[PDB]
Amino acid sequence: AKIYKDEDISLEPIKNKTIAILGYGSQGRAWALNLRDSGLNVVVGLERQGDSWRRAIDDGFKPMYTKDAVAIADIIVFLVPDMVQKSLWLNSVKDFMKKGADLVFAHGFNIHFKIIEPPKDSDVYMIAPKSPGPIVRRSYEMGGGVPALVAVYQNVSGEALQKALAIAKGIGCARAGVIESTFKEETETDLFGEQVILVGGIMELIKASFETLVEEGYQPEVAYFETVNELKLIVDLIYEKGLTGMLRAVSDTAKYGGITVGKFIIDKSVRDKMKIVLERIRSGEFAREWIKEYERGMPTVFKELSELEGSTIETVGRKLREMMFG
């Protein structure tokens, strides 16, 4: 892979460009302030004079409406939630943006699945950190950063990647490491990780483990203690010292258990289903279903949150977290 650090990257490509950050939720704030603190020219563009507008004022910005911001911008950054970007594009960007302004994303989804079709004469690129806004901001203020991907969809200027890298540097990501990718790769791999491990997989692995124990008649409190509680320690080990360093740190009994049973539980049949999930991302099926579900108000997401909240694992979880923290 092509890996860039702060030493590898010049800010000069985006010096004396007006950067319009569209949105001022936690991600937009973080990038806006980091960029401003890095000495760049930042404007904040918003649709409504509401919460986010007032926050931006409190942070010493003078926000403008999107239509105005994009009109003077050389670089326009979409940092509103992905599922709202098409409406912002159509309502307040496409027909207002400075001609030839760069279009910049933090996820490849809308461009990759052709939800937005950009002008032919704009550079289109991405800087994709994988950390919540507050961490992007605090790491930067401490002199560090979080790692990111960079990608380019359209290189009209000749210099798109260098501009993307400059933005990555300006928000602090190059202090940690920037990995070059593509919009296709970031989008497909991002969605796949969410679904099979980061959110879906771990969640249901936890539920299925806990529920196994509870069905067999063990105390739910114990089952939670023996399946959820210690997960933070494990995943901390992995994050710091890899799977090997994790296995070295646990007891001999745990090492043997894990090494012998892991591949029995997560076996070929799981791997085959992982291929299917990936296929449905790659084909565009997932994106289509998700559009439709979002546009209906996410009723599936909300129903399942509600069901989850009232489940044994969550009510037991709540009680014990209460205890561990009267």
Question: What is the CB-side half-sphere exposure of residue 228 using CA atoms within 13 A?
Answer: 21
Measured distance CA(287)–CA(264) in Å, rounded: 32
CA separation for the pair 195, 201 (Å, rounded): 7
Give the separation between CA 93 and CA 119, rounded to whole angstroms.
Answer: 11
Q: Which residues are annotated as a binding site for NADP(+)?
A: 24-27, 48, 52, 82-85, 133
- Please tell me the distance from the alpha carbon of residue 178 to that of residue 147, in angstroms, as a whole number: 6
Residue numbers annotated as active site: 107
- CA 159/CA 166 separation, integer angstroms: 11
Give Dmax (Cα) for the chain: 67
Which helix or strand (DSSP H or E) is residue 148 part of? Answer: strand 148-154
Amino acid identity at 199: V
Hey, how many other C-beta atoms are within 10 angstroms of the C-beta on 6?
16
The single-letter DSSP state of residue 38 is T
Please state, in angstroms and rounded to a whole number, the distance separating the CA atoms of residues 169 and 31: 11
Binding residues: 24-27, 48, 52, 82-85, 133, 190, 194, 226, 230, 251
Detail the DSSP E strand segments found in 67-147.
Answer: 75-78, 102-105, 124-129
| Sheet of 102-105, strand order | 3-4, 178-180, 148-154, 124-129, 102-105, 75-78, 18-22, 41-46, 64-65
Task: Give the domain ranges of the chain.
Answer: 1-181, 182-326
As given in the structure block, the two tokens for residue 51 are 């919460």
Helix axes 26-37, 51-58, angle to 10 degrees: 20
Q: What is the CATH number of domain 182-326?
A: 6.10.240.10
The two structure tokens encoding residue 44: 């904040």
Q: Which of 173, 162, 88 is nearest to 128 (CA)?
A: 173
- Identify the DSSP state of 119: P
For CA atoms 77, 81, 83, 84, give the dihedral sign.
negative
Q: Which CATH number, 3.40.50.1000, 3.30.750.24, 3.40.50.720, 3.40.309.10, labels domain 1-181?
A: 3.40.50.720
Rg (Cα) of the chain, in Å, rounded? 22
CB contact at 8 A, 33 and 137: yes
Q: Which residues are annotated as a binding site for Mg(2+)?
A: 190, 194, 226, 230
Q: Which residue from 76, 81, 128, 138 is spatially nearest to 106, judged by alpha carbons?
A: 128
Query: Residue holding tokens 């937005």?
Result: 116
Query: Which segments within 38-93 are labelled E, that is strand?
Result: 41-46, 64-65, 75-78
The C-alpha atoms of residue 97 and residue 306 are separated, in whole angstroms, by 41
Compute the distance between CA of residue 197 and CA of residue 65 in angstroms, rounded to an integer.
39
First to last CA, the chain: 51
Helix (H) or strand (E) run with residue 3 in it: strand 3-4
Dihedral pair phi/psi, residue 123, rounded to 5°: -60, 140
Contacts of 200 (CB under 8 A, 6+ apart): 194
Spatial CA neighbour of 13 closest among 142, 143, 170: 170
φ/ψ of 117, rounded to 5, equals: -100, 115
Per the listing, tokens 């960029």 go with 35
Structural method:
X-ray
CA distance 249 to 307: 37
Instruction: Enter the tokens of residue 190.
Output: 């991002």
Q: What is the resolution of this structure in A?
A: 1.4
For tokens 């702060």, name the residue.
6
